[PDB]
DNA sequence: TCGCATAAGCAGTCCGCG
DNA sequence: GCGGACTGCTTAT
């Protein structure tokens, strides 16, 4: 096989590399890599190296990496550009793997681990590590085994061995329900003392050294705890055995309000799953506890135990160990679904970076571009210092707040990356500038043509047309990957809808799910068999179809995120190719494209309807337009349609055969006007929205910018078995909104859009009457909590104290003195409840750590003093009043003359 | 919240507004 | 009460 790196490090003058050799074996080597950097040289000097602007360079070969680094310093002292890849391990990988990397994941050791630490005096601080590690479960992807290290003897209690038999039994048998599919994969090792547990763990680690190391909060908790505990018991040298090169570094992670420490293990790639999830999931969660995320992702119930975690080992060691094992398995289950490890490996190997660098789009793009340019013997410019400066972004149209009955939406495929490609925006393709007219003059095609030679953006920038820039070239490659995966995602989605339809009529038989590839649209053959399947088989097929869709979503959306990140990176001062001329060329072109095409669509529709000055485009944001289709429907007449699907077909056909060719023509003209390199503005129909045929539903509404709801029947070619709500920006979509309130508001919106005013009034009346019975967690607000100290004045709110921070200070006073009560962690999330006047907490609200039950010390007082009235008005009534006034209807029935009877 | 970008919404504080 | 100046937080794209 072709060789591939696993990890790469610079240690002084050596590159340390773990890799897979041509025989599939893991190896390690130390290489005295001689880096090359570059200086500009005279024209008379013959060379094959040129910088990105075509200026000649001489290559400087250094005796070692430190010499190269020192040379960079002296060049700065002199005041001359030191060109080339200054991150020598990236240059090493580029030299050593000069081909597209084909990797084999089965050879990559992926370790998933979790530790337990009993602590009587609150949270066990990893930097102190003063409490024994009493359990480690370490899953190894190569062995496919869970290695369980169990401490039987501790200062906090002596316990009996964990029992695998009890672990396997149902909760109803007094067991722990460790999933049967992992029971045979557990390798259990009890220890009589912590020293032997840890020594054996290190020996084990030496035999099975992780390449990718993951788990939940491992970078912030488990790794520094294990490192520091081993350090405290045995000394530094022993702790450094966690690194295959015996090198570690305390790295200080700084943010706006404070800093924290992690342990860098040289020769290991740490991909903490919490951070993978935050980057790649595109969710914003009320809590990031593993219990909360596991429930959300997998629909598994919370791991249930009595008493505090600090007493679980002594009271129920059996459950203590089983829950440690299950916790590791939960992360593997989330990854089986979401496939974030797979994504990380894909992206890292494509870019030729350390896998952990996938968290940084700047680093990722720096490596992609470097490798691309190196292939042509071109030399990358030195990174430079720039002051942070604001720059303009997208245009967003101010909508008239209203109901909107029939709506068709359109938006650009991969807008910003497509703009980059169309205009040819790149550091080395800048050709000059032209004299800019007000933006509206381009929007209206009255401004003079910018250039008859170069490709232009309305911010004043001109670009070469003779050759593609490196940025367009490399962005196109990832875009193409993205498009492939989105295709699979949409196919799985359409396939899911076929299964849902079939589930209306399940057959009474015993059969099996069909063995199919859900990434491809079901054939007629498959559709026929589906219509004969049982509900059991159909539900399993649906599950598989949805898993396939999830896998496609992960692959496509994060590739979309990467290419959009390149557009953003051009506006980040740490990017090697930072240039506000290019960043603004993208955004300003975007502003023009939207407003240009708004004008074109209005003109086209005013002509087909024979009207004048009529606005068909009601809204748009960045790269999208929302078109009122009421007049299109009314030109046919509602009574001509057999059912909802009939008018949806008509609008879909209208969008595809009339709207889109008109849109394409408008954009082709715009391309010629800007003299762009290639027409790539592809604005396809997104949504077709409206009320169910013959209902009193309103179809959709806008309250304002970035705030709307649509009843959608077809989304990017997916025809739903059941209508789906597209709700953007409203409180139903905000993690800060109480869970039960999100649900109630969504149902209010559903009723507005599908059924009408009277239905909405029925539901509001009922919700208002019953809501006090809702569980307190379900009706609590959520907020991130920053700067708790800033607003804390002797345990009380300082000036301008935010509401949620006030709540935390209330909590802090209420639990004062307790070393055991859960502490609110700076920067994490809290649940927030208002408190009625005259409560014993002495303030108007209380907050506690999100994803948790409030401590029993105060729970009862909180429940007793909860202000349901304030809660209802703020989270439910206020937003609903907003939705309904915008939509011009009433959530409460107004009096009429019929009341006289 | 270490990790690409800007636009823009709403909650809440403080305080004016005769 | 509401709204503006401001902070804080959270979305849409
Ligand atoms: N820098 C940056 N720009 C973004 C981000 N999200 C959206 N944008 C910008 C760039 C996008 O091309 C543009 C339109 O966003 P969309 O959500 O419509 O995505 P896009 O058109 O890229 O892909 P699509 O083909 O519509 O799925 O808005 C982001 O997270 N970072
Ligand atoms: Ca635990
Ligand atoms: Ca788009
Ligand atoms: Ca599309
Ligand atoms: Ca059937
Ligand atoms: Ca869009």
PDB file of N, CA and C (backbone and C1' of nucleotides) and ligand atoms in Angstrom, chain A residues 282 391 394 411-419 479 482 486 556-557 560-561 563-569 586-587 621-624 682 686 716, chain B residues 4-6, chain C residues 12-13, ligand 1:
ATOM      1  N   UNK A 282     -23.455  21.668  13.929  1.00  0.00           N
ATOM      2  CA  UNK A 282     -24.359  22.789  13.635  1.00  0.00           C
ATOM      3  C   UNK A 282     -25.623  22.776  14.485  1.00  0.00           C
ATOM      4  N   UNK A 391     -15.122  45.419   8.197  1.00  0.00           N
ATOM      5  CA  UNK A 391     -15.416  45.528   6.761  1.00  0.00           C
ATOM      6  C   UNK A 391     -16.848  45.067   6.475  1.00  0.00           C
ATOM      7  N   UNK A 394     -23.004  41.199   4.067  1.00  0.00           N
ATOM      8  CA  UNK A 394     -24.146  40.958   3.199  1.00  0.00           C
ATOM      9  C   UNK A 394     -25.208  42.056   3.271  1.00  0.00           C
ATOM     10  N   UNK A 411     -32.025  30.563  -3.939  1.00  0.00           N
ATOM     11  CA  UNK A 411     -30.733  31.078  -3.462  1.00  0.00           C
ATOM     12  C   UNK A 411     -29.529  30.486  -4.200  1.00  0.00           C
ATOM     13  N   UNK A 412     -28.411  31.206  -4.157  1.00  0.00           N
ATOM     14  CA  UNK A 412     -27.209  30.810  -4.873  1.00  0.00           C
ATOM     15  C   UNK A 412     -26.607  29.542  -4.286  1.00  0.00           C
ATOM     16  N   UNK A 413     -26.264  28.598  -5.154  1.00  0.00           N
ATOM     17  CA  UNK A 413     -25.446  27.465  -4.742  1.00  0.00           C
ATOM     18  C   UNK A 413     -24.070  27.976  -4.315  1.00  0.00           C
ATOM     19  N   UNK A 414     -23.663  27.602  -3.103  1.00  0.00           N
ATOM     20  CA  UNK A 414     -22.345  27.934  -2.570  1.00  0.00           C
ATOM     21  C   UNK A 414     -21.930  29.369  -2.945  1.00  0.00           C
ATOM     22  N   UNK A 415     -22.693  30.340  -2.438  1.00  0.00           N
ATOM     23  CA  UNK A 415     -22.627  31.743  -2.882  1.00  0.00           C
ATOM     24  C   UNK A 415     -21.231  32.358  -2.884  1.00  0.00           C
ATOM     25  N   UNK A 416     -20.606  32.456  -1.711  1.00  0.00           N
ATOM     26  CA  UNK A 416     -19.314  33.141  -1.615  1.00  0.00           C
ATOM     27  C   UNK A 416     -18.196  32.427  -2.367  1.00  0.00           C
ATOM     28  N   UNK A 417     -18.125  31.078  -2.262  1.00  0.00           N
ATOM     29  CA  UNK A 417     -17.148  30.359  -3.070  1.00  0.00           C
ATOM     30  C   UNK A 417     -17.414  30.492  -4.563  1.00  0.00           C
ATOM     31  N   UNK A 418     -18.685  30.540  -4.969  1.00  0.00           N
ATOM     32  CA  UNK A 418     -19.014  30.740  -6.382  1.00  0.00           C
ATOM     33  C   UNK A 418     -18.632  32.131  -6.873  1.00  0.00           C
ATOM     34  N   UNK A 419     -18.717  33.124  -5.983  1.00  0.00           N
ATOM     35  CA  UNK A 419     -18.290  34.496  -6.301  1.00  0.00           C
ATOM     36  C   UNK A 419     -16.774  34.542  -6.505  1.00  0.00           C
ATOM     37  N   UNK A 479     -15.308  22.365  -3.188  1.00  0.00           N
ATOM     38  CA  UNK A 479     -16.709  22.546  -3.601  1.00  0.00           C
ATOM     39  C   UNK A 479     -17.258  21.308  -4.313  1.00  0.00           C
ATOM     40  N   UNK A 482     -17.948  18.629  -1.856  1.00  0.00           N
ATOM     41  CA  UNK A 482     -19.180  19.025  -1.163  1.00  0.00           C
ATOM     42  C   UNK A 482     -20.425  18.636  -1.947  1.00  0.00           C
ATOM     43  N   UNK A 486     -23.521  16.204  -0.933  1.00  0.00           N
ATOM     44  CA  UNK A 486     -24.869  16.759  -0.822  1.00  0.00           C
ATOM     45  C   UNK A 486     -25.851  15.955  -1.674  1.00  0.00           C
ATOM     46  N   UNK A 556     -21.182  16.880   3.680  1.00  0.00           N
ATOM     47  CA  UNK A 556     -21.462  18.038   2.834  1.00  0.00           C
ATOM     48  C   UNK A 556     -21.378  19.373   3.572  1.00  0.00           C
ATOM     49  N   UNK A 557     -22.026  19.480   4.737  1.00  0.00           N
ATOM     50  CA  UNK A 557     -22.130  20.781   5.414  1.00  0.00           C
ATOM     51  C   UNK A 557     -20.779  21.293   5.924  1.00  0.00           C
ATOM     52  N   UNK A 560     -18.863  22.510   2.934  1.00  0.00           N
ATOM     53  CA  UNK A 560     -19.436  23.853   2.780  1.00  0.00           C
ATOM     54  C   UNK A 560     -18.826  24.833   3.793  1.00  0.00           C
ATOM     55  N   UNK A 561     -18.718  24.413   5.057  1.00  0.00           N
ATOM     56  CA  UNK A 561     -18.142  25.263   6.097  1.00  0.00           C
ATOM     57  C   UNK A 561     -16.674  25.594   5.818  1.00  0.00           C
ATOM     58  N   UNK A 563     -15.122  25.743   2.743  1.00  0.00           N
ATOM     59  CA  UNK A 563     -14.989  26.684   1.625  1.00  0.00           C
ATOM     60  C   UNK A 563     -15.480  28.089   1.971  1.00  0.00           C
ATOM     61  N   UNK A 564     -16.571  28.170   2.737  1.00  0.00           N
ATOM     62  CA  UNK A 564     -17.041  29.444   3.272  1.00  0.00           C
ATOM     63  C   UNK A 564     -16.028  30.053   4.236  1.00  0.00           C
ATOM     64  N   UNK A 565     -15.294  29.180   4.938  1.00  0.00           N
ATOM     65  CA  UNK A 565     -14.205  29.594   5.823  1.00  0.00           C
ATOM     66  C   UNK A 565     -13.050  30.251   5.074  1.00  0.00           C
ATOM     67  N   UNK A 566     -12.802  29.827   3.833  1.00  0.00           N
ATOM     68  CA  UNK A 566     -11.775  30.476   3.010  1.00  0.00           C
ATOM     69  C   UNK A 566     -12.143  31.928   2.677  1.00  0.00           C
ATOM     70  N   UNK A 567     -13.403  32.152   2.312  1.00  0.00           N
ATOM     71  CA  UNK A 567     -13.924  33.512   2.110  1.00  0.00           C
ATOM     72  C   UNK A 567     -13.782  34.360   3.378  1.00  0.00           C
ATOM     73  N   UNK A 568     -14.097  33.762   4.525  1.00  0.00           N
ATOM     74  CA  UNK A 568     -13.934  34.424   5.826  1.00  0.00           C
ATOM     75  C   UNK A 568     -12.478  34.652   6.209  1.00  0.00           C
ATOM     76  N   UNK A 569     -11.617  33.680   5.894  1.00  0.00           N
ATOM     77  CA  UNK A 569     -10.192  33.761   6.240  1.00  0.00           C
ATOM     78  C   UNK A 569      -9.485  34.949   5.579  1.00  0.00           C
ATOM     79  N   UNK A 586     -15.645  40.084  -2.388  1.00  0.00           N
ATOM     80  CA  UNK A 586     -16.634  38.999  -2.285  1.00  0.00           C
ATOM     81  C   UNK A 586     -17.975  39.513  -1.778  1.00  0.00           C
ATOM     82  N   UNK A 587     -17.950  40.209  -0.637  1.00  0.00           N
ATOM     83  CA  UNK A 587     -19.188  40.615   0.040  1.00  0.00           C
ATOM     84  C   UNK A 587     -19.945  41.678  -0.747  1.00  0.00           C
ATOM     85  N   UNK A 621     -31.866  37.729   1.908  1.00  0.00           N
ATOM     86  CA  UNK A 621     -30.791  37.796   2.891  1.00  0.00           C
ATOM     87  C   UNK A 621     -29.553  37.147   2.301  1.00  0.00           C
ATOM     88  N   UNK A 622     -28.540  37.977   2.043  1.00  0.00           N
ATOM     89  CA  UNK A 622     -27.217  37.551   1.560  1.00  0.00           C
ATOM     90  C   UNK A 622     -27.222  37.082   0.098  1.00  0.00           C
ATOM     91  N   UNK A 623     -27.909  35.976  -0.177  1.00  0.00           N
ATOM     92  CA  UNK A 623     -27.874  35.347  -1.494  1.00  0.00           C
ATOM     93  C   UNK A 623     -29.228  34.730  -1.856  1.00  0.00           C
ATOM     94  N   UNK A 624     -30.272  35.096  -1.113  1.00  0.00           N
ATOM     95  CA  UNK A 624     -31.582  34.464  -1.274  1.00  0.00           C
ATOM     96  C   UNK A 624     -32.672  35.465  -1.622  1.00  0.00           C
ATOM     97  N   UNK A 682     -25.642  30.446  -9.750  1.00  0.00           N
ATOM     98  CA  UNK A 682     -26.687  29.456  -9.999  1.00  0.00           C
ATOM     99  C   UNK A 682     -27.701  29.521  -8.870  1.00  0.00           C
ATOM    100  N   UNK A 686     -35.384  26.906  -3.754  1.00  0.00           N
ATOM    101  CA  UNK A 686     -35.233  26.237  -2.468  1.00  0.00           C
ATOM    102  C   UNK A 686     -36.583  25.656  -2.030  1.00  0.00           C
ATOM    103  N   UNK A 716     -35.771  21.839  -1.995  1.00  0.00           N
ATOM    104  CA  UNK A 716     -34.675  21.438  -2.889  1.00  0.00           C
ATOM    105  C   UNK A 716     -34.899  20.076  -3.575  1.00  0.00           C
TER     106      UNK A 716
ATOM    107  P    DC B   4      -9.168  29.826  12.791  1.00  0.00           P
ATOM    108  O5'  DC B   4     -10.298  30.340  11.823  1.00  0.00           O
ATOM    109  C5'  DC B   4     -11.218  31.401  12.131  1.00  0.00           C
ATOM    110  C4'  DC B   4     -11.654  32.073  10.848  1.00  0.00           C
ATOM    111  C3'  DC B   4     -12.673  33.196  10.962  1.00  0.00           C
ATOM    112  O3'  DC B   4     -12.092  34.435  11.320  1.00  0.00           O
ATOM    113  C1'  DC B   4     -13.270  31.766   9.186  1.00  0.00           C
ATOM    114  P    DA B   5     -12.891  35.505  12.108  1.00  0.00           P
ATOM    115  O5'  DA B   5     -13.840  36.155  11.006  1.00  0.00           O
ATOM    116  C5'  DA B   5     -13.296  36.757   9.819  1.00  0.00           C
ATOM    117  C4'  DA B   5     -14.413  37.158   8.884  1.00  0.00           C
ATOM    118  C3'  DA B   5     -15.487  38.034   9.516  1.00  0.00           C
ATOM    119  O3'  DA B   5     -15.096  39.411   9.522  1.00  0.00           O
ATOM    120  C1'  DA B   5     -16.507  36.297   8.258  1.00  0.00           C
ATOM    121  P    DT B   6     -15.935  40.438  10.426  1.00  0.00           P
ATOM    122  O5'  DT B   6     -17.317  40.644   9.664  1.00  0.00           O
ATOM    123  C5'  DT B   6     -17.367  41.136   8.310  1.00  0.00           C
ATOM    124  C4'  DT B   6     -18.805  41.295   7.878  1.00  0.00           C
ATOM    125  C3'  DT B   6     -19.604  42.340   8.661  1.00  0.00           C
ATOM    126  O3'  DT B   6     -20.492  43.013   7.763  1.00  0.00           O
ATOM    127  C1'  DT B   6     -20.635  40.223   8.905  1.00  0.00           C
TER     128       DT B   6
ATOM    129  P    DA C  12     -31.473  30.572  12.856  1.00  0.00           P
ATOM    130  O5'  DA C  12     -30.977  31.723  11.875  1.00  0.00           O
ATOM    131  C5'  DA C  12     -31.772  32.904  11.647  1.00  0.00           C
ATOM    132  C4'  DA C  12     -31.378  33.547  10.339  1.00  0.00           C
ATOM    133  C3'  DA C  12     -31.100  32.571   9.198  1.00  0.00           C
ATOM    134  O3'  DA C  12     -31.677  33.100   8.005  1.00  0.00           O
ATOM    135  C1'  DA C  12     -29.135  33.860   9.664  1.00  0.00           C
ATOM    136  P    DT C  13     -31.735  32.357   6.598  1.00  0.00           P
ATOM    137  O5'  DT C  13     -30.311  32.598   5.929  1.00  0.00           O
ATOM    138  C5'  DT C  13     -29.946  33.907   5.485  1.00  0.00           C
ATOM    139  C4'  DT C  13     -28.454  34.021   5.274  1.00  0.00           C
ATOM    140  C3'  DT C  13     -27.811  32.978   4.365  1.00  0.00           C
ATOM    141  C1'  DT C  13     -26.374  33.778   6.134  1.00  0.00           C
TER     142       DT C  13
HETATM  143  N1  LIG D   1     -17.517  33.377   6.401  1.00  0.00           N
HETATM  144  C1  LIG D   1     -18.696  32.726   6.554  1.00  0.00           C
HETATM  145  N2  LIG D   1     -19.664  32.966   5.634  1.00  0.00           N
HETATM  146  C2  LIG D   1     -20.865  32.357   5.704  1.00  0.00           C
HETATM  147  C3  LIG D   1     -21.143  31.425   6.795  1.00  0.00           C
HETATM  148  N3  LIG D   1     -22.404  30.982   6.607  1.00  0.00           N
HETATM  149  C4  LIG D   1     -22.887  31.580   5.485  1.00  0.00           C
HETATM  150  N4  LIG D   1     -21.960  32.408   4.959  1.00  0.00           N
HETATM  151  C5  LIG D   1     -22.039  33.237   3.739  1.00  0.00           C
HETATM  152  C6  LIG D   1     -21.221  32.468   2.702  1.00  0.00           C
HETATM  153  C7  LIG D   1     -22.273  31.648   1.998  1.00  0.00           C
HETATM  154  O1  LIG D   1     -21.840  31.223   0.704  1.00  0.00           O
HETATM  155  C8  LIG D   1     -23.424  32.642   1.975  1.00  0.00           C
HETATM  156  C9  LIG D   1     -24.777  31.995   1.804  1.00  0.00           C
HETATM  157  O2  LIG D   1     -24.962  31.064   2.858  1.00  0.00           O
HETATM  158  P1  LIG D   1     -25.857  29.750   2.600  1.00  0.00           P
HETATM  159  O3  LIG D   1     -26.252  29.219   3.940  1.00  0.00           O
HETATM  160  O4  LIG D   1     -26.898  30.049   1.538  1.00  0.00           O
HETATM  161  O5  LIG D   1     -24.739  28.728   2.055  1.00  0.00           O
HETATM  162  P2  LIG D   1     -24.099  28.560   0.593  1.00  0.00           P
HETATM  163  O6  LIG D   1     -24.792  29.382  -0.469  1.00  0.00           O
HETATM  164  O7  LIG D   1     -22.619  28.713   0.794  1.00  0.00           O
HETATM  165  O8  LIG D   1     -24.365  26.992   0.328  1.00  0.00           O
HETATM  166  P3  LIG D   1     -25.732  26.308  -0.233  1.00  0.00           P
HETATM  167  O9  LIG D   1     -25.272  25.860  -1.591  1.00  0.00           O
HETATM  168  O10 LIG D   1     -26.761  27.407  -0.239  1.00  0.00           O
HETATM  169  O11 LIG D   1     -25.985  25.190   0.734  1.00  0.00           O
HETATM  170  O12 LIG D   1     -23.374  33.310   3.241  1.00  0.00           O
HETATM  171  C10 LIG D   1     -20.042  31.215   7.764  1.00  0.00           C
HETATM  172  O13 LIG D   1     -20.204  30.442   8.726  1.00  0.00           O
HETATM  173  N5  LIG D   1     -18.879  31.879   7.583  1.00  0.00           N
END
